[PDB]
Amino acid sequence: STGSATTTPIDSLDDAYITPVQIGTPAQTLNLDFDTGSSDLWVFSSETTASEVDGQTIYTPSKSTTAKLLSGATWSISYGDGSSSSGDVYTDTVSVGGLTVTGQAVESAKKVSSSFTEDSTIDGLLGLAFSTLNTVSPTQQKTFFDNAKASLDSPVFTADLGYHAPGTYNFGFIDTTAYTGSITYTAVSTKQGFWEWTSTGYAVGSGTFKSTSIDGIADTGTTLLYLPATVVSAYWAQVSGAKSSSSVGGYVFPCSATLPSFTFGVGSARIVIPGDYIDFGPISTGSSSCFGGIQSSAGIGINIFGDVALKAAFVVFNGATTPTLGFASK
């Protein structure tokens, strides 16, 4: 089997991407944030505290003839941005882009934090990291990809995120029309439950490439590119007036600037992030200070190749017995 679904930016900045997901019988379609940095499929639901729902589409398990309470199971998750959610668990039929999994754990939110209430565009998360991170207790549950894997034509999914435009998540096949040149594959460590890999280095604009190992995670559920402070300082030094602002919480730059590109290494290959991809717009409405798309990972404890990086590539998440990542230009 295969599946193919379009992913759409939630706003004009690409702060996140939503992908429609069918849950239950008859189908209830929710728009979920596909997140290669976590391993829970959770949804706004009929169980979510009413004051914490503001415009999201909810899953109602009582209206699904295939929904079953997973007796005794609870879940509770915290993300890197300090957001959180928790609740109980159903199994149900879940389809993405024509690919169907029966008996998928669908984590129903009883509580969500303020950032999830305040974002009407995201109806929940679909985790695509390794199932060792899944938070369901007392019986840990598998991701949608882990449940689908054996049925797929090839044990892979791909992320093809757009810049200010829709893109695609494919399951079970590699669309050879979706990228240029060749796909370079690189080793993955699953020891932290992430798609963790080591970039071979970077360049800033037309500058020389610096060969240096940068260990980090491929994380579709993080907006920005988080790298070591040395690398980030080197990038923003090329932008007149850019500075790290303690009050804003990262690098800002004059909105009048033209940003340089940023290149990262994948083995001997290179992925170029155009400068425009690094502009996250005014820090507040009408400001001439703009928020940078490359930020320091200092204090986070890991480097994160988030959407700013991934949207410059066609990315293969190879779930073979020994997982690997692939990157192509596009």
Catalytic residues: 35, 199
Torsions phi, psi of 174, nearest 5? -110, 115
Question: 301: which DSSP letter?
Answer: S
CB 79 to ligand A1CFR: min, Å? 4
Query: How many Å is the maximal CA-CA distance in the chain?
Result: 60
- What does the buried/exposed string (b/e) look like for 210-226 if buried means 16 or more CB atoms within 10 Å of the residue's CB? beeebebbbbbbbbbbb
Binding residues for ligand A1CFR restricted to 192-211, rule: CB under 6 A = none
Binding residues with ligand A1CFR: total (CB under 6 A): 14
Site string for ligand A1CFR, 228-257 (x = CB under 6 A): ------------------------------
Among 5, 16, 128, 312, binds ligand A1CFR (CB under 6 A): 16
Name which of 54 and 175 has its Cβ closer to ligand A1CFR: 54
99 strand-pairing partners: 96
Question: 255: which DSSP letter?
Answer: T
Binding residues for ligand A1CFR restricted to 67-86, rule: CB under 6 A = 79, 81, 83
CB 77 to ligand A1CFR: min, Å? 8
| Alpha-carbon separation of residue 200 from 87, 210, 312 (angstroms) | 41, 8, 17
231: left (phi over 0), alpha (psi -120 to 50) or beta: alpha
Q: Is 123 in the site for ligand A1CFR (CB under 6 A)?
A: no
Closest CA to 16 of 306, 255, 294, 284: 306
CB 226 to ligand A1CFR: min, Å? 12
Give residues preceding each break in the chain, C–N over 2.5 A: none
Site string for ligand A1CFR, 33-72 (x = CB under 6 A): x-x-xx----------------------------------
| Residues contributing to the site for ligand A1CFR (CB under 6 A) | 16, 33, 35, 37-38, 79, 81, 83, 115-116, 119, 122, 125, 221
